[PDB]
Design a protein around this ligand. Structure first.
Ligand SMILES: [Cl-]
Length: 163
């Protein structure tokens, strides 16, 4: 575990993380993907061997000895708000179990279902609160990776407001 388990947020490419493992905001088919998706694939392509896993689950594949945790958040384009919310909470619970099983002291994580899978809605608070529900009981240092300065500010404020 980390000596003083913390949350931090960084506004940068998760492919350049400084943590002991990475959560890929995965598709269920283990497909390399397109756009910002390809970043994780480009950095750790070996981790996409047999990475396919259902919505609401997480599957870890090693790239060398570096764990890539494929976490499949729901695509809110396909799910009702209610069922998408359930699967989003479940995907993070499976991430907490994987991070624990791996025995890492740190994990880089994105806000699942807030990008291409957001169904065009702002899910910062929804996704972050499910992340906290799952990871609060883990002792890894959690570093949340985002794209936009405003999201960095809002994630930072939500973290600091509990400390
Ligand atoms: Cl997404």
């Amino acid at each position: 575990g980390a000596m003083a388990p913390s949350y931090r947020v960084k506004r940068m490419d998760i492919a350049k993380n400084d943590e002991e493992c990475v959560v890929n905001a995965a598709n269920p088919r283990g497909l390399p993907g397109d756009g910002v998706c390809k970043a994780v694939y480009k950095k750790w392509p070996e981790s996409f061997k047999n990475s396919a896993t259902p919505v609401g689950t997480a599957k870890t594949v090693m790239c060398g000895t570096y764990p890539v945790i494929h976490a499949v958040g729901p695509n809110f384009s396909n799910y009702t708000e209610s069922e998408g919310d359930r699967e989003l909470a479940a995907a993070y619970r499976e991430v907490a179990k994987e991070v624990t099983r791996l025995g890492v002291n740190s994990v880089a994580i994105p806000l699942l279902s807030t990008g291409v899978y957001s169904g065009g809605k702002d899910r910062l608070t929804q996704s972050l609160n499910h992340l906290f529900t799952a990871m609060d009981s883990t002792d890894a240092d959690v570093v949340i990776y985002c794209r936009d300065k405003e999201w960095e500010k809002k994630i930072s404020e939500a973290i600091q407001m509990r400390t």
